[PDB]
Amino acid sequence: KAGRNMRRKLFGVLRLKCHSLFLDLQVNSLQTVCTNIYKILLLQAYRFHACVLQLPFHQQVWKNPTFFLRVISDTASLCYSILKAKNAGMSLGAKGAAGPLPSEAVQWLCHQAFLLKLTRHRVTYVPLLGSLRTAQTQLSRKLPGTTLTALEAAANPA
Numbered sequence: 202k203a204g205r206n207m208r209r210k211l212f213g214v215l216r217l218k219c220h221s222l223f224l225d226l227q228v229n230s231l232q233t234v235c236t237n238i239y240k241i242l243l244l245q246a247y248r249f250h251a252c253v254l255q256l257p258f259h260q261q262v263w264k265n266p267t268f269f270l271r272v273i274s275d276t277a278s279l280c281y282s283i284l285k286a287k288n289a290g291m292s293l294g295a296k297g298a299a300g301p302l303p304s305e306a307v308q309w310l311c312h313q314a315f316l317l318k319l320t321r322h323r324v325t326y327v328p329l330l331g332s333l334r335t336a337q338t339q340l341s342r343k344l345p346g347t348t349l350t351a352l353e354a355a356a357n358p359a
């Protein structure tokens with residue numbers, strides 16, 4: 202427990218730096234880009250949960266659920282902005298895909314990563330799991346680009 206916390210704290214910045222180097226669809230496969238942005242978002246979800254555990258006892262999650270959901274949304278926006286900048290010089294012969302990832306896909310990966318972590322602590326996060334679970338289908342009805350299952354593949358490896 203104290204060993205896991207030490208490892209997350211120690212490797213946080215380095216892991217994020219490393220993942221950020223594999224987001225360029227010009228040189229990387231789409232599967233790689235999706236996996237690495239997802240691993241970034243999952244890392245962020247763990248940091249999120251750590252930060253929530255140290256909120257005052259009266260600052261319950263059901264008390265201000267807009268705050269937490271917006272934090273989650275802002276995470277997707279920020280990772281998406283990073284991804285955009287990293288893919289700015291993309292050309293027609295890019296290895297990754299014909300299309301650089303829409304914000305819908307980064308959003309989907311974000312909600313996925315947060316759900317996986319937040320379902321482990323339902324007693325704390327039952328107010329949020331409602332809105333996030335719909336957003337998944339809200340986005341799954343917004344864009345089933347087939348590649349939706351290629352996103353599910355990136356959220357799968359252990």
Ligand SMILES: N[C@@H](CCC(=O)N[C@@H](CS)C(=O)NCC(=O)O)C(=O)O
Nearest residue numbers: 216218219220221223233236237240
């Ligand atoms: N992410 C690289 C491989 C490099 C690698 O494995 N190093 C980092 C990820 S950038 C790491 O922390 N290892 C994998 C993990 O622990 O999830 C790739 O997809 O080809």
Ligand SMILES: N[C@@H](CCC(=O)N[C@@H](CS)C(=O)NCC(=O)O)C(=O)O
Nearest residue numbers: 206209210213244247248251252255
């Ligand atoms: N502690 C985070 C790593 C991120 C981090 O280093 N930031 C804060 C977390 S709010 C920190 O300095 N750690 C103090 C703590 O959680 O005891 C984690 O468990 O993943």
